[PDB]
Design a protein around this ligand. Sequence first.
Ligand SMILES: *CCC1=C(C)C(=O)NC1Cc1[nH]c(/C=C2\N=C(C[C@H]3NC(=O)C(CC)=C3C)C(C)=C2CCC(=O)O)c(CCC(=O)O)c1C
Ligand SMILES: *CCC1=C(C)C(=O)NC1Cc1[nH]c(/C=C2\N=C(C[C@H]3NC(=O)C(CC)=C3C)C(C)=C2CCC(=O)O)c(CCC(=O)O)c1C
Ligand SMILES: *CCC1=C(C)C(=O)NC1Cc1[nH]c(/C=C2\N=C(C[C@H]3NC(=O)C(CC)=C3C)C(C)=C2CCC(=O)O)c(CCC(=O)O)c1C
Ligand SMILES: *CCC1=C(C)C(=O)NC1Cc1[nH]c(/C=C2\N=C(C[C@H]3NC(=O)C(CC)=C3C)C(C)=C2CCC(=O)O)c(CCC(=O)O)c1C
Ligand SMILES: *[C@H](C)C1=C(C)C(=O)N[C@H]1Cc1[nH]c(/C=C2\N=C(C[C@H]3NC(=O)C(CC)=C3C)C(C)=C2CCC(=O)O)c(CCC(=O)O)c1C
Ligand SMILES: *[C@H](C)C1=C(C)C(=O)N[C@H]1Cc1[nH]c(/C=C2\N=C(C[C@H]3NC(=O)C(CC)=C3C)C(C)=C2CCC(=O)O)c(CCC(=O)O)c1C
Ligand SMILES: *[C@H](C)C1=C(C)[C@@H](CC2=N/C(=C\c3[nH]c(C[C@@H]4NC(=O)C(C)=C4[C@H](*)C)c(C)c3CCC(=O)O)C(CCC(=O)O)=C2C)NC1=O
Ligand SMILES: *[C@H](C)C1=C(C)[C@@H](CC2=N/C(=C\c3[nH]c(C[C@@H]4NC(=O)C(C)=C4[C@H](*)C)c(C)c3CCC(=O)O)C(CCC(=O)O)=C2C)NC1=O
Ligand SMILES: *[C@H](C)C1=C(C)[C@@H](CC2=N/C(=C\c3[nH]c(C[C@@H]4NC(=O)C(C)=C4[C@H](*)C)c(C)c3CCC(=O)O)C(CCC(=O)O)=C2C)NC1=O
Ligand SMILES: *[C@H](C)C1=C(C)[C@@H](CC2=N/C(=C\c3[nH]c(C[C@@H]4NC(=O)C(C)=C4[C@H](*)C)c(C)c3CCC(=O)O)C(CCC(=O)O)=C2C)NC1=O
Ligand SMILES: CCC1=C(C)[C@@H](CC2=N/C(=C\c3[nH]c(CC4NC(=O)C(C)=C4CC)c(C)c3CCC(=O)O)C(CCC(=O)O)=C2C)NC1=O
Ligand SMILES: CCC1=C(C)[C@@H](CC2=N/C(=C\c3[nH]c(CC4NC(=O)C(C)=C4CC)c(C)c3CCC(=O)O)C(CCC(=O)O)=C2C)NC1=O
Ligand SMILES: CCC1=C(C)[C@@H](CC2=N/C(=C\c3[nH]c(CC4NC(=O)C(C)=C4CC)c(C)c3CCC(=O)O)C(CCC(=O)O)=C2C)NC1=O
Ligand SMILES: CCC1=C(C)[C@@H](CC2=N/C(=C\c3[nH]c(CC4NC(=O)C(C)=C4CC)c(C)c3CCC(=O)O)C(CCC(=O)O)=C2C)NC1=O
Lengths: 164, 164, 164, 164, 176, 176, 176, 176
Amino acid sequence: MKSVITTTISAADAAGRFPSSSDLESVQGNIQRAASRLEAAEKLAGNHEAVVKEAGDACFAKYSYLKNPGEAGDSQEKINKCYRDIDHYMRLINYSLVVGGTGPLDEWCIAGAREVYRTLNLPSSSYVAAFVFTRDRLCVPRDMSAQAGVEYGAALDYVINSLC
Amino acid sequence: MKSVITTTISAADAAGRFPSSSDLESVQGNIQRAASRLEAAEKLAGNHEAVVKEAGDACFAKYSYLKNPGEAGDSQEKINKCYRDIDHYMRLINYSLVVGGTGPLDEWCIAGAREVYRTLNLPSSSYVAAFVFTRDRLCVPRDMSAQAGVEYGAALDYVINSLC
Amino acid sequence: MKSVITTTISAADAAGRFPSSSDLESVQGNIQRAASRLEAAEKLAGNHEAVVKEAGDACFAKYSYLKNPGEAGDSQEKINKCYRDIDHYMRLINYSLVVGGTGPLDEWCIAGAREVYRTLNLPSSSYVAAFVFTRDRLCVPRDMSAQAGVEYGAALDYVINSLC
Amino acid sequence: MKSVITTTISAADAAGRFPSSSDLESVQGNIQRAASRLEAAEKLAGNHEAVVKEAGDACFAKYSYLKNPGEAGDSQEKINKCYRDIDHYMRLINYSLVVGGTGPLDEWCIAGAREVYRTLNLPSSSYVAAFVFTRDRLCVPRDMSAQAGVEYGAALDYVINSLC
Amino acid sequence: MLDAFSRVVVNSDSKAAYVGGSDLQALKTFIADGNKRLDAVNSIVSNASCIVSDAVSGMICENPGLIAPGGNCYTNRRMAACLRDGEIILRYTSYALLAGDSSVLEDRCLNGLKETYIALGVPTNSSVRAVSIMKSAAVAFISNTASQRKMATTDGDCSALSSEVASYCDKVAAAI
Amino acid sequence: MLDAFSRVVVNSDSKAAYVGGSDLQALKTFIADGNKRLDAVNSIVSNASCIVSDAVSGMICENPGLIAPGGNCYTNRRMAACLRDGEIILRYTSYALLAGDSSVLEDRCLNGLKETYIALGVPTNSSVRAVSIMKSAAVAFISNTASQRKMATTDGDCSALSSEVASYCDKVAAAI
Amino acid sequence: MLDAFSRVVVNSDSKAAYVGGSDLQALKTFIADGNKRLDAVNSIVSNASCIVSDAVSGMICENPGLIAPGGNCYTNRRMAACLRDGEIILRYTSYALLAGDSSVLEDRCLNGLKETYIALGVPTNSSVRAVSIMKSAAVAFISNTASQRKMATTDGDCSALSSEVASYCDKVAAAI
Amino acid sequence: MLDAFSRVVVNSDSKAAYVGGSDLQALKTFIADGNKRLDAVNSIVSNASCIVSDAVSGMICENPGLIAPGGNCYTNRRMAACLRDGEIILRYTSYALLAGDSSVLEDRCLNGLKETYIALGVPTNSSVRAVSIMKSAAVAFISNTASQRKMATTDGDCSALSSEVASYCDKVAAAI
Ligand SMILES: *CCC1=C(C)C(=O)NC1Cc1[nH]c(/C=C2\N=C(C[C@H]3NC(=O)C(CC)=C3C)C(C)=C2CCC(=O)O)c(CCC(=O)O)c1C
Ligand SMILES: *CCC1=C(C)C(=O)NC1Cc1[nH]c(/C=C2\N=C(C[C@H]3NC(=O)C(CC)=C3C)C(C)=C2CCC(=O)O)c(CCC(=O)O)c1C
Ligand SMILES: *CCC1=C(C)C(=O)NC1Cc1[nH]c(/C=C2\N=C(C[C@H]3NC(=O)C(CC)=C3C)C(C)=C2CCC(=O)O)c(CCC(=O)O)c1C
Ligand SMILES: *CCC1=C(C)C(=O)NC1Cc1[nH]c(/C=C2\N=C(C[C@H]3NC(=O)C(CC)=C3C)C(C)=C2CCC(=O)O)c(CCC(=O)O)c1C
Ligand SMILES: *[C@H](C)C1=C(C)C(=O)N[C@H]1Cc1[nH]c(/C=C2\N=C(C[C@H]3NC(=O)C(CC)=C3C)C(C)=C2CCC(=O)O)c(CCC(=O)O)c1C
Ligand SMILES: *[C@H](C)C1=C(C)C(=O)N[C@H]1Cc1[nH]c(/C=C2\N=C(C[C@H]3NC(=O)C(CC)=C3C)C(C)=C2CCC(=O)O)c(CCC(=O)O)c1C
Ligand SMILES: *[C@H](C)C1=C(C)[C@@H](CC2=N/C(=C\c3[nH]c(C[C@@H]4NC(=O)C(C)=C4[C@H](*)C)c(C)c3CCC(=O)O)C(CCC(=O)O)=C2C)NC1=O
Ligand SMILES: *[C@H](C)C1=C(C)[C@@H](CC2=N/C(=C\c3[nH]c(C[C@@H]4NC(=O)C(C)=C4[C@H](*)C)c(C)c3CCC(=O)O)C(CCC(=O)O)=C2C)NC1=O
Ligand SMILES: *[C@H](C)C1=C(C)[C@@H](CC2=N/C(=C\c3[nH]c(C[C@@H]4NC(=O)C(C)=C4[C@H](*)C)c(C)c3CCC(=O)O)C(CCC(=O)O)=C2C)NC1=O
Ligand SMILES: *[C@H](C)C1=C(C)[C@@H](CC2=N/C(=C\c3[nH]c(C[C@@H]4NC(=O)C(C)=C4[C@H](*)C)c(C)c3CCC(=O)O)C(CCC(=O)O)=C2C)NC1=O
Ligand SMILES: CCC1=C(C)[C@@H](CC2=N/C(=C\c3[nH]c(CC4NC(=O)C(C)=C4CC)c(C)c3CCC(=O)O)C(CCC(=O)O)=C2C)NC1=O
Ligand SMILES: CCC1=C(C)[C@@H](CC2=N/C(=C\c3[nH]c(CC4NC(=O)C(C)=C4CC)c(C)c3CCC(=O)O)C(CCC(=O)O)=C2C)NC1=O
Ligand SMILES: CCC1=C(C)[C@@H](CC2=N/C(=C\c3[nH]c(CC4NC(=O)C(C)=C4CC)c(C)c3CCC(=O)O)C(CCC(=O)O)=C2C)NC1=O
Ligand SMILES: CCC1=C(C)[C@@H](CC2=N/C(=C\c3[nH]c(CC4NC(=O)C(C)=C4CC)c(C)c3CCC(=O)O)C(CCC(=O)O)=C2C)NC1=O
């Protein structure tokens, strides 16, 4: 799971080395930035359903043509999966904010995603629509602190940039 | 030059990745621990000659037999180089404290050192004597702050552990 | 076990070849030089204890500081192991003279020896002292024939050169 | 050029090693067997033309069908090359006896020989006929000493065994 | 590769000198602007796709001969090649920026690039139009003056950082 | 490999659940003891040579048959092999300790170790005497109760950490 | 691999003992018969092609089912495979003979051979008929009693050597 | 690589000639001095460590700029590099000496060395001061005139051998 601690340890393991100052400083940085990514993570976890629901509504608002027969929203089961996928992604962002790195996003949702969506006809743009909406929707200090806005917005940009 | 920043960047370069949260947190740790390793570094740089001189005296006090003919202290030029070597090592510790990692020690003095000393008959123990003396000699808060003592003592233990 | 016969056979095995003239000439050389290395080997085997004991006494005579607390001779058990190690080395020289090559020395005592001694604080110089003493102590024709002196002195120089 | 000296040196070069006892014993064997392979070599060099001529006559005696049109002896130029080839081989045996190993035979006449003869229709058996004749023709002590007979017969068996 | 501190140490070493007091205070300035630097890096990498296709589309925008038969962005295979190269250069300049040193840009990316391009047939006047567009896309994002997207940061002067990132882009435009 | 947070995330994931509030407060406790943990790791790695030759010398101390002909520390080559293995295990348990998870100890070091040893002939009752000595050398250094060397740290109870490092050493003594 | 002397040294070592006087005199006997041994090796290798196609032709001679469809010498490819294997085994037993030890025969040739053959389908009762024929072809040549070819050596009893070479051939016939 | 005999054979071959009688008697002279040659080789290799650190210490002795910042023996890493290179060259000249031909010195060690050094920055005037010191350390040991160590050999004139070993050292000093 990519993270400060794992990245550093496995650099040292590759070299045969005990941990040294670089490694301990790296974890210390994990301590400093802990307190605002965990804030984002808790706000996200506490309101996941409303965020997921605004994001999916924004997606299908931008691409109403998806509800046509043959598109990826031509049935209520299919639209509901769409919001499910968005929730999966936001759960993984929650994980990413808790770990401190993009590990969870990377392995659990980015990896097969271009092939899977190419094959089930899921336009990349619709997810980008849902994450861009969420990103721009966030409000400081209403929704969370400034440096937690940074962390949250950041994971969202990462997931967006994996679909470009 | 091994360090938080270099270790992280080259983990990401190996992966084809832009910097991400793990990387930025890692540098943030470099910022936090900066202020006490630079304190050690400045105290060391400001009093290098007296430290080098007590360490070399301690070495030749522990191993007076080195001053015998055939040993590595059988001439004034040779004893003077001994203190020179100790100074080289403390300069590299200065570098190590400024960079934030053991890079400078690693490349510039550890690498050839077992072969070189095996070949010029320089007992490993004498350097260990000089670094152990310096380490135990340090005094908090007299000589430096507590977390700078940690950094200084640490680089010294690293260089000691490279001669065992 | 490195030796004329083994070196030649495994050159031929690497090439897919039956033995040929080079190989048979090589063994013939083993026959010619047999009779003086076996002489050294038998003289060494017949007086191993006195040689081991003069060598260890010479070592601790040259480095009396080893008997200090903390050194590798600070206890009777430790000094006794020192003479034991010297005996191990002379047993391996016995093997080396019987095989005809440095095989036994190579695998059974050279291989881990720098790491082991680095870690148990055993100065390389002390063994060099003991082997140099033995080498210079040998006397022709008193102690053995001239071409056996050559063989014996040679294995000793080899083991010495593995500690430089 | 494969030989005792070259085989040993390049075993040591592969290992990073200075020459040691195995290597010096190997050369010593080269010294011992020198004096009878050089005897063979000088007798061969002193009577090469008569040996080449009896061998080629024996070949074309055994395989008179080679002189038919279409065979490898259908012209005087072709028969003359046949004796030339036999001479090449005996020159290489001369080299092999002087070097002490099969090097010269190996590189200079064995290497391309199956392809070359397959392509110019030169039956392998005819050369085998010529070398077997020479081998069986040798007479001790008339033609050379016993241990030189061994060396000469040996190179001939080697070249024979390269055509089976 | 080196960073800001390793670079000070290499220079100190060429004189066999412990790190000057002047150099230490420079480094503590580096440390003081640590967090602005992280925001700088974050504002480039969060927009990397924007920056790279802006620049390549623009390169082609100003010279459509690149996408006529025989131009180096002609097939899909070459277009995708160029997008990858834009992305790679941007990645090595974001390493530079996060490092405080151009060490890694020069070592791992620019070394032999000019030759490679000469060999392949890659127009160099065009690569640098792209890189110079990326330069402006990037210093915009750093300085938070990009037209169609903002990034909430605290109020300060980030101009030294922008100049840094532009100096690394110019190192690229010069390597070829 | 996983660390403390990745481990909480893997467990949350098996239920398809965002990270519980209970788990978040556990993690902020982990973060609160961050600096004690770093001192723990520093006190092991600064003494690694001590710990490893203490333990191997002790193993041989209690059973000199290991260094009689046919014992597995007999030649210099095998003695040096054993010292390397002591050092390696200590390295993977210092990774564990710095990680907060035994993930890397189990994955990169213990997996197949029992088999490898069975194959080589490496006495396993002895490996674990060594590992159990390393266990005490290490929790001494953590707890700052080592006889011949102290390490100036601030006054606190480091007992949870010591128990952690002893649990990783016991994972080793159990893998074989 | 070991030879006669290395083998004496390994045995001496298992007792931590310098080489006995009894062992030294055995070795000087080995050295005394050095030149007979070289003639032994020379008489095998100078006839290797004879020995290997004698044996394989004979194997097929006594059991023509090997060269009927489905037999393991059926195609040219399998026949040539078998000739190579005959040659290889003879080579490793001529290494044994020149070495004075079966170390290299067992290590580099026989180890896993039985398994390999079981896997491929190579009849083992037939491999050993071939190897047992090679045994006699070889001890003939050593003892200089081969019908159609002699090799001028001096008059002596080479029987210990012949028995040696037959013991190595039997090691082969037993490995499968 | 070639040795003394292979070298005579290559020269004979360029004329398609069997080995002259003159050449045979030269070779039997080579054989006559076989044992002196072995003593020559033994006197170098038994002192190799002496010869190599004598020479490198001396090189640095006469020009201490090598171990000032920027000199090529400056760090421990470069000093150890130079010691290895001294050792390597001495090894290839002891191969030459044991071979009777400079074939292996030129082929496996000197070929491209000049280029490699130019590339690395290795001072060539200094490499050859070291090699020229090794030359004298070596011909001393051969001729048994070394100050601080003797080697009991029988009384004879070993001057041709010393000149040989000095000619190989000069081949090195010339390759760069
Ligand atoms: C680049 C200049 C920007 C311009 C466009 C501007 O007008 N304001 C700007 C940026 C800026 N940031 C700070 C201070 C902080 N930046 C922070 C985030 C980074 N530090 C981190 O650890 C992380 C990654 C893990 C970062 C992305 C933080 C945490 C701070 C400090 C407190 C805060 O602002 O929330 C300043 C100066 C303000 C200061 O106190 O230094 C400026 C100008
Ligand atoms: C392991 C328990 C130790 C026992 C033996 C004890 O009696 N006191 C102990 C350790 C301990 N350390 C702290 C707090 C700190 N430790 C620090 C160093 C580590 N933090 C880092 O960033 C680095 C590496 C880069 C470390 C090596 C630091 C900086 C602190 C905080 C301030 C300080 O103490 O100097 C505590 C608790 C004190 C606290 O405020 O947390 C204890 C018990
Ligand atoms: C294997 C037994 C043979 C039987 C068939 C027999 O009736 N006579 C036999 C062989 C035999 N050879 C010797 C002695 C020598 N063999 C020599 C050649 C080998 N020594 C070498 O260096 C080389 C290769 C390079 C060999 C091929 C040599 C040189 C000798 C010694 C002198 C000589 O005979 O020419 C003996 C015993 C005679 C003795 O003095 O040992 C026997 C029985
Ligand atoms: C290099 C010249 C030396 C100078 C310094 C000198 O005054 N005497 C010298 C050397 C020398 N050695 C011999 C003859 C021998 N050298 C022998 C050992 C080498 N032969 C080997 O097989 C081995 C390795 C396995 C050697 C190291 C041997 C055995 C001899 C022959 C008999 C003996 O001297 O013990 C000579 C000439 C004397 C001669 O009869 O050739 C010289 C001058
Ligand atoms: C893009 C802005 C350029 C414009 C101008 C254009 O018309 N074509 C452009 C780019 C381009 N680059 C390649 C092929 C390579 N580029 C290479 C260098 C990059 N590869 C790296 O790993 C890195 C970083 C260290 C760099 C900077 C290399 C190497 C190649 C060759 C390998 C390959 O993928 O072909 C091409 C394609 C040329 C062709 O026809 O193959 C183009 C069009
Ligand atoms: C020693 C006498 C020289 C003096 C003069 C000096 O100031 N530095 C010296 C030597 C030196 N050599 C290297 C690095 C290499 N040397 C190479 C050639 C050797 N490597 C071989 O395998 C052989 C035999 C065939 C030769 C003769 C090669 C190759 C290298 C490069 C590989 C390496 O280990 O670096 C250096 C270090 C230069 C640096 O900064 O890396 C020095 C100082
Ligand atoms: C054809 C002439 C044409 C192309 C297609 C573009 C080339 C170009 N882009 C320049 C600057 C630039 N690009 C970006 C990223 C972009 N802007 C946003 O707000 C966001 C979001 C994106 C994604 C599309 C930025 C931020 C900038 C900054 C400068 C600016 O004026 O916007 C540019 C200027 C180069 C220069 O300064 O010389 C060019 C030529 N632009 C075209 O006109
Ligand atoms: C033979 C019976 C014998 C050997 C040689 C040792 C084996 C042993 N060591 C134990 C614990 C231990 N080792 C260290 C490191 C050591 N102590 C220091 O202060 C420093 C510095 C070093 C480097 C030498 C430590 C810190 C400890 C901690 C515990 C202690 O009592 O010191 C140990 C105890 C294992 C157990 O608790 O069962 C053994 C058996 N010890 C020998 O007696
Ligand atoms: C079919 C039944 C048949 C085959 C084709 C042969 C198998 C066989 N060979 C035996 C022994 C053997 N082979 C050689 C090599 C051969 N003899 C020479 O003189 C020369 C030259 C060559 C090259 C062809 C030798 C030397 C020997 C020695 C023993 C002998 O009697 O000649 C053999 C006997 C095995 C046994 O003892 O049980 C068999 C079965 N032989 C056939 O009859
Ligand atoms: C600095 C000026 C200085 C260094 C350190 C040395 C350089 C040097 N050595 C020369 C020759 C040489 N070295 C050895 C090996 C040495 N001598 C021994 O007896 C033993 C044992 C060793 C190991 C230390 C030998 C044998 C020689 C032979 C020649 C001699 O005079 O001893 C040397 C001379 C080169 C020349 O002839 O131009 C130099 C410059 N010497 C120093 O003075
Ligand atoms: C991590 C998960 C996080 C999100 C992201 C947001 C997402 C979000 N914001 C909302 C609510 C909300 N947010 C804003 C924005 C806004 N208002 C201001 O004063 C400033 C200047 C602006 C910041 C740009 C407005 C104006 C509303 C009310 C408008 C509406 O809800 O329709 C609502 C509706 C639920 C509610 O009313 O509370 C959601 C779901 N909430 C979260 O928990
Ligand atoms: C990074 C470089 C750093 C070093 C490391 C030290 C090293 C050092 N300490 C000294 C000086 C010094 N240090 C102590 C130790 C001491 N005293 C106490 O009150 C406490 C309880 C003890 C801490 C264990 C004593 C007792 C002395 C005076 C004794 C003496 O100098 O002989 C001196 C002599 C110079 C002087 O007198 O100032 C040196 C060189 N100095 C440095 O700049
Ligand atoms: C392979 C194992 C081999 C060794 C190596 C030696 C080692 C050795 N030499 C001794 C004995 C010994 N050796 C010499 C040397 C000497 N005398 C001369 O006439 C010439 C010119 C000198 C050659 C340089 C002297 C002078 C003595 C007597 C001095 C003494 O023993 O204290 C002794 C004492 C035991 C005894 O007295 O016999 C030993 C142990 N012995 C061995 O078996
Ligand atoms: C290395 C190069 C070497 C060769 C190989 C031989 C090859 C050889 N032998 C010959 C000559 C020769 N050789 C023998 C063999 C023979 N006679 C005996 O007393 C014993 C018992 C027999 C050993 C088996 C006979 C019988 C003759 C005479 C028969 C004849 O020449 O026609 C001849 C004819 C030239 C001559 O008459 O001198 C040649 C060419 N010569 C060499 O220089």
